[PDB]
């Protein structure tokens, strides 16, 4: 493994703060909870600080910490993202939904003290305002899927692509297509991975005494495929 793996043995806090601009409908997230890496485990809740969430919040799980993710121990040497902490990466997405716009976003994951933080600035253009996602025609659910992971060495980090595919609440799907690069913010050495992927699962629910828009989540995520 990795120097950064040692960084992940525990229960890790968790900070997520998102700004986004959507068609300019502007918004924020601020997340907390935590991750346990042993168990691929992540449990989290996320809260709209500017009112309403003008997009689904479904839409946004993949955007709101890979680190987080179990790697078998045979894979270890495969874990790029522990590999990068604790001066962390730099994770760069476009998401491509089907028939409507796009989001464009640049997260920095890395510790702030023992607290491991994710900052996201959050980009969609060309949505329709009455489609699937401005509309808010989305279930609040979340179905399990693969996430393929491939090195790019030139570039010192990892691409992935992937499609996401979220339930239209008249019973269809809006495929989310996912090209991802990371690349490491700091200069030590990272591990660069075989091709292998992360499997997802992620349960959304609600808090029965928040009252502002949020989402909670527990995610599990681990690495296979090799």
Known sequence: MSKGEELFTGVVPILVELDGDVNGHKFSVSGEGEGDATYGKLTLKFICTTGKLPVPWPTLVTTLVQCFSRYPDHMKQHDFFKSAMPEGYVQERTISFKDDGNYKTRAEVKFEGDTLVNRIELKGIDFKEDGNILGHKLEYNYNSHNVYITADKQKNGIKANFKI????????????????????????????????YLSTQSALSKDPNEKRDHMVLLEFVTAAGI
Do not use: C, F, K, M
């Open 165 to 196: 595919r979220h339930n239209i609440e008249d019973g269809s799907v809006q495929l989310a297509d996912h090209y991802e690069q990371n690349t490491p913010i700091g200069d030590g050495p990272v591990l660069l991975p075989d091709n292998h």
